Amino acid sequence: MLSVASRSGPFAPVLSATSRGVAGALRPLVQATVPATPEQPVLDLKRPFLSRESLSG
Amino acid sequence: MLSVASRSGPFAPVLSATSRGVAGALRPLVQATVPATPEQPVLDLKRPFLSRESLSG
Amino acid sequence: PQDLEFTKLPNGLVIASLENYSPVSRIGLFIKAGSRYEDFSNLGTTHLLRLTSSLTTKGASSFKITRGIEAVGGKLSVTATRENMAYTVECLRGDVDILMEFLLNVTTAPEFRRWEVADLQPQLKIDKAVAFQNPQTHVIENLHAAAYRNALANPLYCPDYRIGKVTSEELHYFVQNHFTSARMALIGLGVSHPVLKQVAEQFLNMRGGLGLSGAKANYRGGEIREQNGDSLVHAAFVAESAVAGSAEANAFSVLQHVLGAGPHVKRGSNTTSHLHQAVAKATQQPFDVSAFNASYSDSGLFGIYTISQATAAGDVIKAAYNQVKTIAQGNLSNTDVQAAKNKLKAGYLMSVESSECFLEEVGSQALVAGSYMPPSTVLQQIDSVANADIINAAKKFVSGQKSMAASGNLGHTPFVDEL
Amino acid sequence: PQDLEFTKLPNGLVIASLENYSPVSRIGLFIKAGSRYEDFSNLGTTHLLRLTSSLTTKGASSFKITRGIEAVGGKLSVTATRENMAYTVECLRGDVDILMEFLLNVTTAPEFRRWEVADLQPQLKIDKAVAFQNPQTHVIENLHAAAYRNALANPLYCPDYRIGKVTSEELHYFVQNHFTSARMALIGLGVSHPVLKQVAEQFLNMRGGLGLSGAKANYRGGEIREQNGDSLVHAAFVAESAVAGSAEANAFSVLQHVLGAGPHVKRGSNTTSHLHQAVAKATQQPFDVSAFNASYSDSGLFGIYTISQATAAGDVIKAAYNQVKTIAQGNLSNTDVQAAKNKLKAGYLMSVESSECFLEEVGSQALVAGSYMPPSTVLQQIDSVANADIINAAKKFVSGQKSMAASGNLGHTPFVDEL
Secondary structure (H helix, E strand, C coil): CCCHHHCCCCCCCEEECCCCCCCCCCCCCCCCCCCCCCCCCCCCCCCCCCCCCCCCC | CCCCCCCCCCCCCCCCCCCCCCCCCCCCCCHHHCCCCCCCCCCCCCCCCCCCCCCCC | CCCCCCECCCCCCEEEECCCCCCEEEEEEEECCCHHHCCCCCCCHHHHHCHHHHCCECCCCHHHHHHHHHHHCCEEEEEECCCCEEEEEEEEHHHHHHHHHHHHHHHHCECCCHHHHHHHCCHHHHHHHHHCCCHHHHHHHHHHHHHECCHHHCCCCCCHHHCCCCCHHHHHHHHHHHCCCCCEEEEECCCCHHHHHHHHHHHHCCCCCCCCCCCCCCECCCEEECCCCCCEEEEEEEEEECCCCCHHHHHHHHHHHHCCCCCCCCCCCCCCCHHHHHHHCCCCCCEEEEEEEECCCCCEEEEEEEEEECCCHHHHHHHHHHHHHHHHCCCCCHHHHHHHHHHHHHHHHHHHHCHHHHHHHHHHHHHHCCCCCCHHHHHHHHHHCCHHHHHHHHHHHHHCCCEEEECCCCCCCCCCCCC | CCCCCCEECCCCCEEECCCCCCCEEEEEEEECCCHHHCCCCCCCHHHHHHHHHHCCCCCCCHHHHHHHHHHHCCEEEEEECCCCEEEEEEEEHHHHHHHHHHHHHHHCCCCCCHHHHHHHCCHHHHHHHHHCCCHHHHHHHHHHHHHECCHHHCCCCCCHHHCCCCCHHHHHHHHHHHCCCCCCEEECCCCCHHHHHHHHHHHHCCCCCCCCCCCCCCECCCEEECCCCCCEEEEEEEEEECCCCCHHHHHHHHHHHHCCCCCCCCCCCCCCCHHHHHHHHHCCCCEEEEEEEEECCCCEEEEEEEEEECCCHHHHHHHHHHHHHHHHCCCCCHHHHHHHHHHHHHHHHHHHHCHHHHHHHHHHHHHHCCCCCCHHHHHHHHHCCCHHHHHHHHHHHHHCCEEEEEECCCCCCCCCCCC
């Protein structure tokens, strides 16, 4: 129960040879997008978002 | 009597297109040299010090 | 048709396995070593240490590890956090004995080639930069620095001045001082327990028990304002909270979930949340407020986190704090508590549900406890909580001194103790 | 053989002159505007505006200013501080009619062509960097940021995110609102007074009275820390002090000079200062310790500043601070106090003794009231001070809330609250 993954809180980075390490908890997002204009920083040698977790033919 | 000369304290920069900003008030300086190692930062696009307002032949 | 078999060793290394029937076997090896274990003499060491996993060791070339794991089609990942450093690897079921042979190797006798490490130092800027692509990380891995005198104050990411000067010798020192067998625990999924009894046998020769275990992480109330050109100021009031495994921690959990800490319906205002509604009539829509709770074995943290327009922030964070104060008055409805406890049940079940987060769960729990606790047993404790414990929790959050962090324009945000 | 001819004008412009017979005429212009009048909206504008001195104006091309001032062999200069901003120019007696006309053009009618401003934008980082080559500054600008909620907290140097975003419109908005003629004061020297009655009269046609004049700069107790790899940790801690014109402020000056604000002997350990003689018997010789005293019209600051080995830091500032505590005990002989009063008399007469710093003095106190205060009168004001007033000053320091700023390894430095 004591793992932070079950709780809202700090991210635990998941560096890997292939897969991107999306994880963690709020730290609000998506809910921030519902109000108008959260423009967010772009292209600081930025990695692509979402990641291809939904692979299909 | 608010002047840095009348009351030693924070530097007052003399920074300008025609002259270096060196001046100010103590703020300890030089005295540290008798004690070991006042190494001073080196070549972060550093200007030469002193600023030769005290020219001589 | 199977439940996990917890087990220890004479060596003291915890081991466990939960047989499944999914084709991808997935084993993980967790260590108690983390970012809180640095002192001032070495810092950002772990941030490199997790990057160094792909490097050559005494038992294998980096080309062999990379091309080998990729040829298998499996993959390795190094999860990391302030309390724990969690190695993990996934593969097809027939491939296990191969990839694990890399796994333990990477953590048993790494050879930190100094030139390779120097080659990986520049990478630190890239990883640290992409990690801060989200401002919230910049806020919290800064807020901890604002809350703690000592151990937990240390950033997960390497400080900029250390990016070019981390040395392999520090890596070795941290490795024999913190990859102790007593600190380690091993978890499997597709792999059966009895074969883990032998494949994990390899590590028994490696590394004796007991590590270093310094520090205590004392609290501090200081602020860290930053002042940037960003319009959407972030903010985070925080007060110390008891954790972990205490019922009081359960009280703070139910406390955050009363306050709408958890996301639910998309494209809709969180009407049941006290904070979103307290702010919605306080200021115009562009905002996002939510409760924040962090669990660490020495001590934990609790407090609101807010995103808001720079002009509106002073109204928003104060409204959100007053919303906590009303609960601190003992004015709390019976129903929202039930809804919150339900949000915790569904939430914890959602966290446990995915196999990978399940592995993180079983392992992170295996380190701190040495006794696996089935989720229903969690449900009796989480149902056990009384309203009075919650009221006392809010009273504790209000009575305590406030740490705070706040990136943004900061043109209107009140200083801690001023609001 | 003449006292300076202080004079006010109907425009509200203040004017003064002090005839000499040194060939270098040297005039100065003092605007009350400073870094403090900046707010969050246009922070860092002053740091560029000081560098805009050579830019083209409505009455002259920039080539004409630079080539003119150089061909004459005279030179313009732009001193600046958190309070006053101070233009100045030096020239031979026969050439003033040219150069002062540039000054009239620089402050009253400075058009800011945007491309020329954009060209100067990158330079701010260079000037800020060479300014940060000096170790005390990097601490003390952070110290003011740690010591004030509001006006005085604003840095003299441009914040890194603002280096490219400063615009000409913000420059104008800062110019009309803060280069008010009522704020201005003009201080000649070798130049004769009546011709100043002429050229100042040329200044009178521009600008109405009273500037925007906001803010108050409230005090605060917050910390700022940097954490670096440097062995030479260096830091300051500061309590509030009444400023200025009070006997109490003189008591803080006499106090810092009891503590030994600075060395009088080159290449010599400071035998008389209590702080050096405390820290020297406390730890190793490599250090430097002295009192600090900021003095601003809204508020003043006082407190010890130190440079030391990172391991020894907590041994140092916990020692020198105790020295102040000894003064709180009333432990203070009359003799060393007389020595300190003599140190202020001699040191003040020295700092005044140069003509340029003298012009800084006259131009500094021309704005607070304008009634010139002869050095002998200042000597009366220090001679007036009693030992009990000094004890009250140290008592206010010990009893007051404290702020701190620090830069170095920071492994051993105490946090501000413990101090």
